Amino acid sequence: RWRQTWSGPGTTKRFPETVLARCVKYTEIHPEMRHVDCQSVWDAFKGAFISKHPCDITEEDYQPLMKLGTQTVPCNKILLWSRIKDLAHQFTQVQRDMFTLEDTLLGYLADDLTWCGEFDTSKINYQSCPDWRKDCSNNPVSVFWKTVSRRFAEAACDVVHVMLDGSRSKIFDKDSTFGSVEVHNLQPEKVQTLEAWVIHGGREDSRDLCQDPTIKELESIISKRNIQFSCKNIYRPDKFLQCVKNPEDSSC
Ligand SMILES: O=c1c2ncn3c2ncn1[C@@H]1O[C@H](COP(=O)(O)OP(=O)(O)OCC2O[C@@H]3[C@H](O)C2O)[C@@H](O)[C@H]1O
Numbered sequence: 092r093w094r095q096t097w098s099g100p101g102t103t104k105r106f107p108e109t110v111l112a113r114c115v116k117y118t119e120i121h122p123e124m125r126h127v128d129c130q131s132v133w134d135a136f137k138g139a140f141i142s143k144h145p146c147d148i149t150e151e152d153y154q155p156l157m158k159l160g161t162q163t164v165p166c167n168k169i170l171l172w173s174r175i176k177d178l179a180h181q182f183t184q185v186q187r188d189m190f191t192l193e194d195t196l197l198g199y200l201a202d203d204l205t206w207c208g209e210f211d212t213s214k215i216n217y218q219s220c221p222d223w224r225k226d227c228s229n230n231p232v233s234v235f236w237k238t239v240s241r242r243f244a245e246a247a248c249d250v251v252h253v254m255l256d257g258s259r260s261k262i263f264d265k266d267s268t269f270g271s272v273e274v275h276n277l278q279p280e281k282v283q284t285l286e287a288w289v290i291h292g293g294r295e296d297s298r299d300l301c302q303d304p305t306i307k308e309l310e311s312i313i314s315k316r317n318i319q320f321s322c323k324n325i326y327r328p329d330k331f332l333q334c335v336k337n338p339e340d341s342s343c
Pocket residue numbers: 170171172173174175176191192193198202203232233236240243267268269270273
């Protein structure tokens with residue numbers, strides 16, 4: 092108890108109750124998910140990781156949950172993001188111009204949560220969970236997000252948008268979920284353009300970050316997939332959000 096088994100934070104307190112509650116809330120608000128049996132969803136979620144070694148999780152483990160979580164998303168209004176989720180969420184909340192993964196049942200259920208079990212016992216581990224870096228990448232949380240992010244990217248069509256954090260050292264990071272999963276799962280048959288919005292943090296007079304080497308890398312990767320690339324700087328994210336809320340404004 093002075094040393095834990097794994098290097099990462101343990102399962103979020105009251106995990107089962109939280110997931111169940113989020114599912115009830117989601118299905119009450121969103122009419123197309125109004126029929127989903129939230130007990131069945133919890134049962135499937137549990138089944139993915141309980142009694143399993145938390146370094147031996149596979150995408151197959153989550154297939155029952157994926158099935159129950161089946162959901163149509165407007166394919167042309169998807170917003171992806173990397174390392175900038177708060178702005179992405181504040182943006183979509185104004186008038187639902189776009190949808191992030193957290194606007195789907197499954198993304199909503201898991202957002203900000205951590206979970207894992209133990210091999211050959213049905214107990215949730217509230218003490219520690221595997222860290223992706225130090226322990227193992229095939230852990231319940233990591234495998235969940237890769238699985239759901241892949242399916243989300245596969246559903247996209249027309250123009251897909253991505254918000255990137257321009258204050259980061261690597262504005263586009265090939266090791267992120269966006270860069271390692273979503274970019275490679277957009278379907279060129281369906282997706283016309285990927286448009287990146289590079290969000291400035293250098294506050295109030297800055298460079299053209301669409302010329303950043305990592306952005307040029309992203310452009311190259313997506314161009315070679317037969318998808319067009321566009322990029323825009325958002326210099327003042329505060330002004331941006333205000334203009335979204337009230338486009339009837341002088342600077343907007
Ligand atoms: O929606 C989430 C999400 N919500 C919560 N999380 C998500 N990860 C990926 N996604 C999807 O991938 C990207 C973001 O992942 P990232 O590039 O690793 O950013 P990031 O590096 O900010 O993501 C950190 C992060 O936070 C958890 C997940 O455990 C994880 O790796 C988005 O486009 C989403 O569609």
